[PDB]
Design a protein around this ligand. Structure first.
Ligand SMILES: [Cl-]
Ligand SMILES: [Cl-]
Ligand SMILES: [Cl-]
Ligand SMILES: [Cl-]
Ligand SMILES: [Mn+2]
Ligand SMILES: [Mn+2]
Ligand SMILES: [Mn+2]
Ligand SMILES: [Mn+2]
Lengths: 370, 370, 370, 370
């Protein structure tokens, strides 16, 4: 359909409330929406990082220039209906910068899907599920605060699973916070943790069993991202399911973790993996090796959460559901359509190509680099 | 689009000339074309085996009943535009019978692609290549015969690569046949062999280096299909590229071979792997592990060769090309359209959904079980 | 003795009561009895599958054609007293289809044994035992129902061991069903489970220890058939005895599991292994590696149960007994002779060649393909 | 048939010419024929060792007492048609002494076969071959002598393969003897060596490749019997086929060598393995692992060579033939029937149960302990 022009703008949307992790506190969330105009029909997509260049090596300002100045040129005037070539071309243009690469991928995928009148889900082969159990993260520094916000979410019938962010406290203090949360939300809720790399193997070995004894069903990224050998030993010595998040990056790293089953669950993240096409391949090596598939997020807006939803509904199985709470933690949206949770599950949209139209008005209100 | 009815018929088409392998001689080639009618628009696909229940555990008669009596029922009245569910449903219906499962998959994939006006290639994400270097197999029992047929194919500018079928002779006699073929077709042609499991490791160890010294670039399935450990030792002790064909079956077996690099190249075969969707996953574990991808055939007709072509054009790289000579060895076609080779390469079709319309007249002429 | 003709017919016999497994519910049981006539004396044998093409890739209709159309031809007019050649010949005729191959094997083995006036047991070298402890399976969906049927079997003095079929329930619900069965039948009965591949390693790792703590002595096929690497990790991390059932197939797969002791017990199944001759070899690699031997069934009729009995009595040791309840769950027999249980043990027959004469009258009553 | 009495006598038969090995020179060959009388029909079998207690830990005098005083008692009055029990009973009576255990096994197997009118071959399931390529061993100390005896054997059309006994010379002198034998008998004959454990790994590593370059197709037991780890390294570093002879003993040692393919070929020896029943199991673990099967001898008389022949004809494949030259090197026989070679192959007998009747007259002439 020949790409006329690929434009991109940065937009900063604040979080209703902070999200204190081990690596950074999320007071605001920056993005990069990529509008790929072609033959009259546009294609929206987005790419961004957490805590700037902290969760990953990318950030809002790096995403923009890598897109505009390095990917965009080689993509202008190219067949818009050829994602195979778009991705190949993007790999010969820049190294890494998966968020930037994924941002552009979404747009071409969205546009092509809309031109055919189908949805990203129907394009990938149709769904298998109409809704995926969403998890809620309790990352505020207060224990009482957490519990209260947690009890209400079970009442409002939207969140049955919980993801506690440990790490900012001492290994001995986080365990106590878990004795409290596990005590109250005992059987009424599911519990998971995400140490955000804070634990140094030894601390992980003595503390993982304790959390295991408290009924925690999944421990995400206990040790550092590169210590994939520790990630394995912990996995063989503990019955708990250990998920890889920061360690996952490229298709090769996915296979590297899957050889000796260094991990139990792969956390699928489009921006951390290079798009939808890249994620599917990792979900393929995970299925072959027998590793479960999750469904993470970079606390991305609706534009992202929607595309990721489309793709996750096509996965054979997500034994742990997902955590697409991006729009729900954000203080505002950049589209006219909202994603609605119904009975602890996030419902899959009913439109063509991630059924979300960018709110030009909402795009104009924030638009800062930061 | 709601599946009205899924019909299937058996058709026996002879080979212009025999294809003597290590396991069987191919005098004729039996098939099973599956016409899935839905909302007025049909969807053609096919599934079959080599030498009956010899290359695989399946055969023409087993494919028909497993399709009609076991897969078809659960698929009638189902959303025709949902391959994700179709495959899932087929896995909960029958075990194995990948040719039968792949036959039906093709049809739904074809139909859906035609309803959208795109091609199977554009559906999977668009091509990366417009033609793939086709290989010619020299499986006749005569050495002089082989060489003559080989020289003409280089002259007619259609076949630059050659696949000699060894195995029916003694290990000492096949080597001589290779001293002759390698001598004449020295630099004007590429040489590959396919022992069809005939060699018992030890014979493979002493004979593979000899063939290696004769300039043979690829040795397909030297040992038995199950002796995946021998397949590995041969691979570490020889520089030649060793390809797995019979050993490849399920996504799990693909990963099993990819862990310690038991093989150099994976031979992609839709009927042996369960369709297009299944093949893509194996092509994913191969890419992650770093194993090259080939592109085999079960000497299937145009209906098959066309779908496989659509999919192979989407693969990032096929360092050894393909061997889609199905229509070219066959004595007749079952469609109005022919696939044409141009300059040693098989060209990718220009229509919607494997651009091939079944010749009802040609379907009627053969139609025997055999 | 020169084989005159090998005939085969399909017969459908219902189950007194359903047998709900993880993969399918058994309301009826289809078979394929192979009558090999030769020099006046016949030889009966049988081959069939569970849930059609679900437990294995074979089913009633596939068994018949593979037998009649592919094995039978090459066997007609051949020396009936040469099983060595019969099997070799069958391997060069078709690939896989072990149930079909085993059906024919039984018949030639039976006939040859009858012509010598000895029994299959005496032919294989004489027995070591006169009876083997039979296990009873509790596969009905009701917990109370199970327990009641279980208590009566201990009273009637026929069943001391029990095999609970888990899988159709949630991992959390099956454990409860085991808290009940283990509670009542505590010391008066032996307990074993068969997850039928339902558990995905991680679920198996947390749940196997729980069942272990409930006194369950054997856990059959926890994970999928192909995930033989998970089967190993579970084995090293748990004291419970883990048995392989679906993973076992060919002699090669048997050795593959025996290398690093991926399993504790091999489940011997004639139809799943290719006959009596094939089973003996697997029982040989199991003895050498130090893996225990079981003695399974495909809920086959008397014809099968009898031949399997003959062979199991020759095995050096069966630490877990067998589960030849085929005739006992069936609603009728196809022979004049019945197999009788006496004091928790299934007794070995007292005739020549599986001492069972097909009831032509009973063969005529069912005979449908289904 | 109830064993009345099991008798055994020692008989010393000289070798026409000496057989100088690395461990001992064979000027004479001692035996132990075991006549098991039962219900009027006798059953002949034999057991013995090479160089007395040198090849193995057994010898003529040890075989007799272990038989008479330890196995015989528990076997008297037992069901003669129950080899399963006979072997089991023998294992609970004495430890090791496989030659003694095998001697008795042959007799019961022979008797049972004769009572049924079939042959040991037909009993085991019928043959697959009517003759097995016999190998001739050149063990005399003279090089010229060897070559002459070798040339005549090719002329008389009886021996195409040759087994040179190395070891008694220096590693540098044996190689020369091979430059001579390989030179003359170049293409007219097959060459194999048997170092009889003389080489100390390092010497084996430098010298095996040299012999390999001389066209030697098989190198039997290069290093010591216990250094099964050296046996493996040599195997991975050399294309030549390495056979295990002295290292093979029990079913467990067979599997131990088959795990990591420490050897290429297993040498089957009834006396070294505990009989026919034991040999079959080793031939089972060899088939599963993919190791080739040979067919050795302890230079045993006709009684032995005949039983071994019966069993080898039932093996799926013997890629290297056998070396049953026992009767042919001996200076006389202990039976009325002779085994005849016809066209480089040793023919399988045509009688019931090893078709050989002990020559009472010939038994009386030698009968010394020695
Ligand atoms: Cl995160
Ligand atoms: Cl092929
Ligand atoms: Cl079962
Ligand atoms: Cl020897
Ligand atoms: Mn995380
Ligand atoms: Mn092939
Ligand atoms: Mn089972
Ligand atoms: Mn030797």
């Amino acid at each position: 359909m020949k790409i006329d022009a690929i434009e991109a703008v940065i937009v900063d949307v604040p979080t209703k409330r902070p999200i204190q992790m081990s690596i950074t506190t999320v007071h605001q969330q920056s993005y990069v929406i990529v509008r790929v105009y072609s033959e009259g029909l546009v294609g929206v997509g987005e790419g961004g990082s957490v805590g700037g260049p902290v969760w990953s090596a990318e950030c809002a300002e790096t995403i923009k220039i890598i897109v505009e100045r390095y990917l965009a040129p080689h993509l202008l005037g190219t067949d818009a209906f050829n994602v195979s070539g778009a991705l190949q071309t993007m790999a010969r243009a820049v190294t890494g910068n998966a968020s930037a690469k994924a941002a552009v991928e979404m747009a071409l995928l969205d546009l092509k899907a809309r031109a055919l009148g189908v949805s990203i889900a129907e394009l990938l082969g149709g769904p298998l599920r109409s809704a995926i159990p969403i998890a809620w993260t309790l990352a505020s520094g207060d224990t009482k605060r957490d519990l209260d916000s947690a009890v209400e979410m079970i009442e409002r019938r939207r969140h049955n699973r919980f993801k506690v962010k440990l790490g900012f406290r001492s290994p001995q203090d986080d365990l106590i916070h878990m004795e409290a949360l596990s005590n109250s939300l005992g059987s009424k809720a599911y519990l998971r943790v995400d140490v955000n790399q804070a634990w140094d193997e030894q601390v992980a070995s003595v503390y993982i069993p304790e959390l295991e004894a408290l009924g925690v069903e999944l421990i995400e990224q206990p040790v550092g991202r590169e210590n994939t050998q520790a990630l394995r030993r912990l996995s063989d010595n503990n019955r708990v399911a250990i998920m890889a998040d920061e360690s996952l990056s490229t298709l090769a790293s996915a296979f590297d973790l899957a050889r000796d089953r260094s991990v139990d669950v792969f956390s699928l993240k489009l921006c951390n993996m290079g798009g939808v096409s890249a994620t599917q391949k990792i979900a393929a090596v995970a299925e072959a090796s027998g590793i479960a598939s999750y469904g993470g997020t970079m606390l991305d807006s609706t534009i992202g959460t929607s595309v990721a939803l489309q793709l996750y509904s096509t996965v054979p199985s997500l034994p742990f559901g997902c955590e697409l709470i991006g729009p729900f933690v954000l203080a505002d949206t950049l589209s006219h359509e909202p994603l609605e949770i119904r009975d602890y599950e996030l419902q899959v949209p009913t439109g063509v190509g991630h059924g979300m139209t960018l709110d030009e008005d909402k795009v104009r209100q924030y638009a800062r680099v930061s």
